[PDB]
Protein backbone atom coordinates (compact mmCIF):
# COMPACT_ATOMS: atom_id res chain seq x y z
CA UNK A 1 0.00 0.00 0.00
CA UNK A 2 2.77 2.46 0.90
CA UNK A 3 4.52 3.87 -2.18
CA UNK A 4 7.11 6.56 -2.88
CA UNK A 5 6.40 8.52 -6.06
CA UNK A 6 9.03 10.81 -7.55
CA UNK A 7 7.65 13.74 -9.56
CA UNK A 8 9.52 16.46 -11.38
CA UNK A 9 8.72 19.97 -10.23
CA UNK A 10 9.38 21.46 -13.68
CA UNK A 11 5.70 22.02 -14.53
CA UNK A 12 4.26 25.34 -13.36
CA UNK A 13 1.52 23.55 -11.42
CA UNK A 14 1.41 20.26 -9.56
CA UNK A 15 -2.06 19.81 -11.04
CA UNK A 16 -3.98 18.28 -8.13
CA UNK A 17 -6.68 19.19 -5.69
CA UNK A 18 -6.66 17.58 -2.25
CA UNK A 19 -9.27 16.85 0.42
CA UNK A 20 -9.42 16.04 4.12
CA UNK A 21 -7.48 16.85 7.26
CA UNK A 22 -7.79 16.26 11.00
CA UNK A 23 -10.11 19.24 11.43
CA UNK A 24 -12.54 17.14 9.32
CA UNK A 25 -14.50 14.18 10.70
CA UNK A 26 -15.63 13.06 7.23
CA UNK A 27 -11.99 12.74 6.07
CA UNK A 28 -9.32 12.79 8.79
CA UNK A 29 -6.72 11.75 6.19
CA UNK A 30 -5.72 14.01 3.31
CA UNK A 31 -6.31 12.37 -0.09
CA UNK A 32 -6.18 13.39 -3.76
CA UNK A 33 -9.55 14.57 -5.07
CA UNK A 34 -8.71 15.24 -8.72
CA UNK A 35 -5.68 15.07 -11.00
CA UNK A 36 -5.64 17.67 -13.74
CA UNK A 37 -4.01 17.33 -17.16
CA UNK A 38 -1.28 19.91 -17.64
CA UNK A 39 0.39 19.38 -14.25
CA UNK A 40 3.22 17.33 -12.80
CA UNK A 41 1.04 14.68 -11.14
CA UNK A 42 -0.75 13.70 -14.36
CA UNK A 43 2.64 13.35 -16.11
CA UNK A 44 3.91 10.86 -13.56
CA UNK A 45 1.16 8.39 -14.45
CA UNK A 46 1.56 7.08 -10.89
CA UNK A 47 -1.01 9.07 -8.86
CA UNK A 48 -4.75 8.49 -8.70
CA UNK A 49 -7.60 10.27 -6.99
CA UNK A 50 -8.21 8.54 -3.66
CA UNK A 51 -4.56 7.95 -2.74
CA UNK A 52 -3.80 8.70 0.93
CA UNK A 53 -1.07 11.35 1.21
CA UNK A 54 1.56 10.43 3.80
CA UNK A 55 4.67 12.52 3.21
CA UNK A 56 6.03 15.08 0.75
CA UNK A 57 9.78 15.80 0.54
CA UNK A 58 10.16 14.23 3.98
CA UNK A 59 7.55 16.47 5.63
CA UNK A 60 4.58 14.70 7.19
CA UNK A 61 1.04 14.88 5.78
CA UNK A 62 -0.57 12.24 8.04
CA UNK A 63 -3.07 13.57 10.60
CA UNK A 64 -2.56 17.25 9.75
CA UNK A 65 -4.93 20.14 9.14
CA UNK A 66 -6.19 20.75 5.60
CA UNK A 67 -4.30 24.06 5.50
CA UNK A 68 -1.12 22.44 6.83
CA UNK A 69 -1.21 19.91 3.98
CA UNK A 70 -1.99 22.59 1.37
CA UNK A 71 0.88 24.86 2.45
CA UNK A 72 3.37 22.01 3.02
CA UNK A 73 2.83 20.54 -0.46
CA UNK A 74 2.91 24.03 -2.03
CA UNK A 75 6.14 24.87 -0.21
CA UNK A 76 7.66 21.58 -1.38
CA UNK A 77 6.55 22.08 -5.01
CA UNK A 78 7.88 25.66 -5.12
CA UNK A 79 11.28 24.53 -3.73
CA UNK A 80 12.94 23.89 -7.07
CA UNK A 81 16.33 23.32 -5.40
CA UNK A 82 15.22 19.75 -4.51
CA UNK A 83 14.44 17.86 -7.72
CA UNK A 84 12.63 15.48 -7.94
CA UNK A 85 9.82 15.76 -5.40
CA UNK A 86 9.16 12.66 -3.29
CA UNK A 87 5.51 11.88 -2.60
CA UNK A 88 4.88 9.04 -0.13
CA UNK A 89 1.32 7.81 -0.60
CA UNK A 90 -0.90 4.97 0.62
CA UNK A 91 -3.06 2.96 -1.82
CA UNK A 92 -6.55 1.67 -0.67
CA UNK A 93 -5.11 -0.21 -12.75
CA UNK A 94 -2.94 2.36 -14.51
CA UNK A 95 -3.27 6.06 -13.82
CA UNK A 96 -3.22 6.81 -17.58
CA UNK A 97 -5.58 4.19 -18.99
CA UNK A 98 -6.49 2.94 -22.45
CA UNK A 99 -9.50 5.27 -22.29
CA UNK A 100 -7.29 8.29 -21.50
CA UNK A 101 -5.09 7.49 -24.49
CA UNK A 102 -8.15 7.02 -26.70
CA UNK A 103 -9.58 10.36 -25.54
CA UNK A 104 -6.32 12.17 -26.27
CA UNK A 105 -6.15 10.53 -29.71
CA UNK A 106 -9.78 11.43 -30.41
CA UNK A 107 -9.13 15.06 -29.46
CA UNK A 108 -6.01 15.20 -31.66
CA UNK A 109 -7.95 13.72 -34.58
CA UNK A 110 -10.63 16.39 -34.04
CA UNK A 111 -7.97 19.12 -34.03
CA UNK A 112 -6.29 17.80 -37.19
CA UNK A 113 -9.59 17.61 -39.10
CA UNK A 114 -10.87 21.02 -37.94
CA UNK A 115 -10.95 23.55 -40.78
CA UNK A 116 -7.62 25.36 -40.72
CA UNK A 117 -6.19 22.82 -38.18
CA UNK A 118 -6.51 23.46 -34.41
CA UNK A 119 -2.80 23.71 -33.54
CA UNK A 120 -3.49 25.10 -30.05
CA UNK A 121 -5.19 21.87 -29.00
CA UNK A 122 -2.49 19.71 -30.58
CA UNK A 123 0.20 21.62 -28.67
CA UNK A 124 -1.83 21.73 -25.44
CA UNK A 125 -2.12 17.95 -25.41
CA UNK A 126 1.18 16.68 -26.73
CA UNK A 127 3.58 19.02 -24.89
CA UNK A 128 1.74 18.18 -21.64
CA UNK A 129 1.96 14.38 -21.88
CA UNK A 130 4.96 12.23 -21.05
CA UNK A 131 6.88 10.49 -23.79
CA UNK A 132 5.34 7.19 -22.72
CA UNK A 133 1.85 8.69 -22.87
CA UNK A 134 2.62 9.97 -26.40
CA UNK A 135 3.45 6.42 -27.47
CA UNK A 136 0.09 5.26 -26.06
CA UNK A 137 -1.65 8.11 -27.89
CA UNK A 138 0.01 7.21 -31.21
CA UNK A 139 -1.04 3.57 -30.75
CA UNK A 140 -4.64 4.58 -30.03
CA UNK A 141 -4.64 7.02 -32.94
CA UNK A 142 -3.61 4.37 -35.45
CA UNK A 143 -6.19 1.93 -34.08
CA UNK A 144 -8.99 4.45 -34.61
CA UNK A 145 -7.94 5.95 -37.98
CA UNK A 146 -5.78 3.20 -39.56
CA UNK A 147 -3.27 6.03 -40.15
CA UNK A 148 -0.08 6.78 -38.27
CA UNK A 149 -0.22 9.81 -35.99
CA UNK A 150 3.20 11.06 -37.09
CA UNK A 151 2.11 11.00 -40.73
CA UNK A 152 -1.15 12.79 -40.00
CA UNK A 153 0.66 15.52 -38.06
CA UNK A 154 3.38 15.90 -40.67
CA UNK A 155 0.61 16.72 -43.10
CA UNK A 156 -1.35 18.99 -40.73
CA UNK A 157 1.58 21.04 -39.31
CA UNK A 158 4.40 23.09 -40.80
CA UNK A 159 7.42 25.14 -39.92
CA UNK A 160 9.21 24.92 -36.60
CA UNK A 161 6.07 23.69 -34.81
CA UNK A 162 6.07 20.62 -37.08
CA UNK A 163 9.68 19.96 -36.09
CA UNK A 164 8.88 20.19 -32.36
CA UNK A 165 5.79 17.98 -32.53
CA UNK A 166 7.29 15.24 -34.72
CA UNK A 167 10.33 15.20 -32.43
CA UNK A 168 8.14 14.75 -29.34
CA UNK A 169 6.40 11.72 -30.89
CA UNK A 170 9.60 9.67 -31.05
CA UNK A 171 10.96 7.72 -28.10
CA UNK A 172 14.16 9.26 -26.69
CA UNK A 173 16.31 6.66 -28.47
CA UNK A 174 14.41 7.06 -31.74
CA UNK A 175 14.75 10.87 -31.52
CA UNK A 176 18.48 10.72 -30.87
CA UNK A 177 19.11 8.06 -33.51
CA UNK A 178 17.17 10.09 -36.08
CA UNK A 179 19.08 13.30 -35.14
CA UNK A 180 22.39 11.41 -35.44
CA UNK A 181 21.36 10.12 -38.87
CA UNK A 182 20.39 13.68 -39.86
CA UNK A 183 23.73 15.12 -38.70
CA UNK A 184 25.53 12.79 -41.14
CA UNK A 185 23.20 13.33 -44.16
CA UNK A 186 24.25 15.11 -47.35
CA UNK A 187 27.63 16.49 -48.24
CA UNK A 188 29.61 17.00 -45.05
CA UNK A 189 28.57 16.83 -41.41
CA UNK A 190 26.73 18.84 -38.78
CA UNK A 191 29.55 18.28 -36.33
CA UNK A 192 27.90 20.44 -33.66
CA UNK A 193 24.84 18.18 -33.49
CA UNK A 194 26.81 14.90 -33.65
CA UNK A 195 29.09 16.21 -30.86
CA UNK A 196 26.17 17.42 -28.70
CA UNK A 197 24.44 14.02 -28.68
CA UNK A 198 27.52 11.78 -28.50
CA UNK A 199 29.20 13.85 -25.76
CA UNK A 200 26.14 14.26 -23.53
CA UNK A 201 24.35 10.88 -23.58
CA UNK A 202 25.05 8.37 -20.80
CA UNK A 203 26.02 4.70 -21.22
CA UNK A 204 22.42 3.60 -20.75
CA UNK A 205 21.15 6.15 -23.28
CA UNK A 206 23.81 5.16 -25.80
CA UNK A 207 23.12 1.44 -25.39
CA UNK A 208 19.54 2.07 -26.50
CA UNK A 209 20.54 4.52 -29.25
CA UNK A 210 22.98 1.97 -30.69
CA UNK A 211 20.27 -0.70 -30.74
CA UNK A 212 17.52 1.53 -32.18
CA UNK A 213 19.83 3.10 -34.81
CA UNK A 214 20.63 -0.38 -36.15
CA UNK A 215 16.92 -1.25 -36.20
CA UNK A 216 15.90 1.96 -37.99
CA UNK A 217 18.76 2.20 -40.47
CA UNK A 218 20.10 -1.40 -40.88
CA UNK A 219 23.67 -0.26 -40.21
CA UNK A 220 25.50 0.20 -36.93
CA UNK A 221 25.85 3.73 -35.63
CA UNK A 222 29.59 3.16 -35.24
CA UNK A 223 29.89 2.28 -38.94
CA UNK A 224 28.12 5.50 -40.02
CA UNK A 225 30.36 7.56 -37.74
CA UNK A 226 33.44 5.86 -39.20
CA UNK A 227 32.17 6.61 -42.72
CA UNK A 228 31.50 10.29 -42.03
CA UNK A 229 34.43 11.41 -39.83
CA UNK A 230 38.19 11.08 -39.84
CA UNK A 231 41.32 11.57 -37.80
CA UNK A 232 41.40 11.89 -34.03
CA UNK A 233 37.90 13.40 -34.12
CA UNK A 234 36.65 10.06 -35.50
CA UNK A 235 38.58 8.16 -32.81
CA UNK A 236 36.99 10.23 -30.05
CA UNK A 237 33.44 9.99 -31.43
CA UNK A 238 33.71 6.22 -32.00
CA UNK A 239 35.02 5.74 -28.47
CA UNK A 240 32.29 7.82 -26.79
CA UNK A 241 29.49 6.32 -28.87
CA UNK A 242 30.21 2.81 -27.54
CA UNK A 243 28.62 3.84 -24.19
CA UNK A 244 31.17 1.79 -22.24
CA UNK A 245 32.44 4.41 -19.79
CA UNK A 246 33.35 3.02 -16.35
CA UNK A 247 30.37 3.12 -14.04
CA UNK A 248 30.43 5.41 -11.03
CA UNK A 249 32.10 3.50 -8.23
CA UNK A 250 31.44 3.58 -4.50
CA UNK A 251 35.15 4.17 -3.72
CA UNK A 252 36.98 7.33 -4.78
CA UNK A 253 40.33 6.39 -6.38
CA UNK A 254 42.49 9.29 -5.22
CA UNK A 255 45.73 7.76 -6.50
CA UNK A 256 44.26 7.39 -10.01
CA UNK A 257 42.74 10.87 -9.80
CA UNK A 258 46.23 12.27 -9.32
CA UNK A 259 47.85 10.00 -11.94
CA UNK A 260 45.21 10.90 -14.55
CA UNK A 261 45.60 14.63 -13.84
CA UNK A 262 49.39 14.34 -14.16
CA UNK A 263 49.01 12.26 -17.33
CA UNK A 264 46.66 14.83 -18.93
CA UNK A 265 49.19 17.57 -18.18
CA UNK A 266 52.18 15.57 -19.43
CA UNK A 267 50.23 14.74 -22.61
CA UNK A 268 49.32 18.32 -23.48
CA UNK A 269 50.40 21.60 -21.89
CA UNK A 270 53.72 20.26 -20.61
CA UNK A 271 55.05 19.17 -24.01
CA UNK A 272 55.45 20.34 -27.57
CA UNK A 273 52.42 19.02 -29.41
CA UNK A 274 49.85 16.73 -27.82
CA UNK A 275 49.48 13.02 -27.05
CA UNK A 276 45.86 12.94 -28.21
CA UNK A 277 45.33 9.18 -27.59
CA UNK A 278 46.16 9.71 -23.91
CA UNK A 279 43.48 12.43 -23.69
CA UNK A 280 40.95 10.22 -25.50
CA UNK A 281 41.56 7.20 -23.27
CA UNK A 282 41.30 9.10 -19.96
CA UNK A 283 38.29 11.21 -20.92
CA UNK A 284 36.26 8.32 -22.45
CA UNK A 285 37.07 5.50 -20.01
CA UNK A 286 36.91 7.03 -16.50
CA UNK A 287 33.62 7.61 -14.71
CA UNK A 288 32.14 11.09 -14.71
CA UNK A 289 32.57 11.69 -10.95
CA UNK A 290 36.16 10.52 -11.22
CA UNK A 291 36.85 12.91 -14.09
CA UNK A 292 35.28 15.83 -12.22
CA UNK A 293 37.91 15.29 -9.57
CA UNK A 294 40.67 14.72 -12.19
CA UNK A 295 39.94 18.10 -13.75
CA UNK A 296 40.14 19.83 -10.32
CA UNK A 297 43.43 18.08 -9.56
CA UNK A 298 44.68 19.01 -13.04
CA UNK A 299 44.61 22.67 -11.96
CA UNK A 300 47.27 21.86 -9.36
CA UNK A 301 49.70 20.83 -12.13
CA UNK A 302 48.68 23.09 -15.03
CA UNK A 303 48.61 26.92 -15.17
CA UNK A 304 45.46 26.56 -17.33
CA UNK A 305 42.29 24.64 -16.53
CA UNK A 306 41.12 21.75 -18.70
CA UNK A 307 38.94 23.85 -21.06
CA UNK A 308 41.67 26.46 -21.57
CA UNK A 309 44.22 23.69 -22.10
CA UNK A 310 42.05 22.18 -24.86
CA UNK A 311 41.84 25.56 -26.60
CA UNK A 312 45.60 25.86 -26.48
CA UNK A 313 46.42 22.30 -27.58
CA UNK A 314 43.96 21.26 -30.31
CA UNK A 315 41.81 22.83 -33.03
CA UNK A 316 38.89 22.18 -35.38
CA UNK A 317 36.39 19.39 -34.83
CA UNK A 318 38.61 17.71 -32.26
CA UNK A 319 38.77 20.87 -30.12
CA UNK A 320 35.01 21.34 -30.42
CA UNK A 321 34.42 17.75 -29.29
CA UNK A 322 36.75 17.94 -26.28
CA UNK A 323 35.29 21.31 -25.16
CA UNK A 324 31.76 19.90 -25.32
CA UNK A 325 32.77 16.66 -23.56
CA UNK A 326 34.52 18.46 -20.67
CA UNK A 327 31.50 20.74 -20.12
CA UNK A 328 29.22 17.68 -20.12
CA UNK A 329 31.40 16.02 -17.51
CA UNK A 330 31.82 19.13 -15.34
CA UNK A 331 28.20 20.35 -15.34
CA UNK A 332 25.80 18.92 -17.87
CA UNK A 333 22.76 21.13 -17.02
CA UNK A 334 25.00 24.18 -17.36
CA UNK A 335 26.27 22.78 -20.69
CA UNK A 336 22.72 22.74 -21.99
CA UNK A 337 21.85 26.12 -20.47
CA UNK A 338 24.83 27.61 -22.32
CA UNK A 339 23.88 25.93 -25.60
CA UNK A 340 20.32 27.27 -25.24
CA UNK A 341 21.61 30.79 -24.54
CA UNK A 342 23.90 30.58 -27.57
CA UNK A 343 20.98 29.40 -29.76
CA UNK A 344 18.99 32.57 -28.92
CA UNK A 345 21.40 35.29 -27.85
CA UNK A 346 21.99 36.87 -31.26
CA UNK A 347 20.18 37.71 -34.49
CA UNK A 348 17.35 35.23 -35.14
CA UNK A 349 17.44 31.77 -33.58
CA UNK A 350 19.33 28.54 -34.14
CA UNK A 351 15.99 26.75 -34.00
CA UNK A 352 17.50 23.33 -34.76
CA UNK A 353 19.51 23.46 -31.54
CA UNK A 354 16.80 25.12 -29.44
CA UNK A 355 14.21 22.52 -30.50
CA UNK A 356 16.48 19.51 -30.00
CA UNK A 357 17.50 20.53 -26.47
CA UNK A 358 13.93 21.33 -25.43
CA UNK A 359 12.60 18.05 -26.85
CA UNK A 360 15.44 15.85 -25.60
CA UNK A 361 15.89 17.30 -22.12
CA UNK A 362 12.27 18.18 -21.26
CA UNK A 363 11.90 14.90 -19.34
CA UNK A 364 15.54 14.50 -18.20
CA UNK A 365 16.96 17.55 -16.38
CA UNK A 366 15.01 20.62 -17.52
CA UNK A 367 14.62 22.06 -14.01
CA UNK A 368 18.39 21.90 -13.40
CA UNK A 369 19.01 23.45 -16.83
CA UNK A 370 16.58 26.26 -15.90
CA UNK A 371 18.25 26.76 -12.51
CA UNK A 372 21.72 27.06 -14.07
CA UNK A 373 20.31 29.31 -16.82
CA UNK A 374 18.62 31.73 -14.39
CA UNK A 375 21.66 31.86 -12.11
CA UNK A 376 24.05 32.68 -14.94
CA UNK A 377 21.97 34.89 -17.26
CA UNK A 378 19.79 36.53 -14.63
CA UNK A 379 16.46 35.97 -16.34
CA UNK A 380 14.73 32.70 -17.00
CA UNK A 381 14.96 30.28 -19.88
CA UNK A 382 11.25 30.99 -20.31
CA UNK A 383 11.95 34.70 -20.82
CA UNK A 384 14.56 34.04 -23.53
CA UNK A 385 12.27 31.64 -25.37
CA UNK A 386 9.48 34.23 -25.22
CA UNK A 387 11.65 36.93 -26.77
CA UNK A 388 13.12 34.71 -29.48
CA UNK A 389 10.11 32.73 -30.73
CA UNK A 390 6.43 33.39 -31.44
CA UNK A 391 3.07 31.76 -32.06
CA UNK A 392 2.10 28.19 -31.35
CA UNK A 393 5.78 27.22 -31.76
CA UNK A 394 6.65 29.49 -28.84
CA UNK A 395 3.80 28.04 -26.73
CA UNK A 396 5.03 24.50 -27.42
CA UNK A 397 8.58 25.38 -26.28
CA UNK A 398 7.28 27.15 -23.17
CA UNK A 399 5.32 24.05 -22.18
CA UNK A 400 8.50 21.94 -22.64
CA UNK A 401 10.31 24.46 -20.46
CA UNK A 402 7.55 23.79 -17.88
CA UNK A 403 7.34 27.10 -16.08
CA UNK A 404 9.01 30.44 -15.48
CA UNK A 405 11.73 31.11 -12.90
Amino acid sequence: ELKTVTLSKMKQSLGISISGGIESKVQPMVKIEKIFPGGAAFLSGALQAGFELVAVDGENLEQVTHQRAVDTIRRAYRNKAREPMELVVRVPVKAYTNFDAERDALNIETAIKTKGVDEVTIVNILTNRSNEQRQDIAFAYQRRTKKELASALKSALSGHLETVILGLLKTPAQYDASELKASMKGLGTDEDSLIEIICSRTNQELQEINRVYKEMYKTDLEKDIISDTSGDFRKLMVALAKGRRAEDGSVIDYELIDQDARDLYDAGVKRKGTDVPKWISIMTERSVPHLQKVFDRYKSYSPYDMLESIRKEVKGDLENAFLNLVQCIQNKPLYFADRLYDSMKGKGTRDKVLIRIMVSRSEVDMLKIRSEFKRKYGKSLYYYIQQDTKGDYQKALLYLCGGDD
Partner: peptide, 6 residues
Protein backbone atom coordinates in the same frame (compact mmCIF):
# COMPACT_ATOMS: atom_id res chain seq x y z
CA UNK B 1 -15.37 18.38 2.85
CA UNK B 2 -12.60 20.91 2.15
CA UNK B 3 -11.27 20.63 -1.46
CA UNK B 4 -8.29 22.85 -2.48
CA UNK B 5 -6.48 23.02 -5.88
CA UNK B 6 -2.76 23.11 -4.83
Amino acid sequence: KKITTV
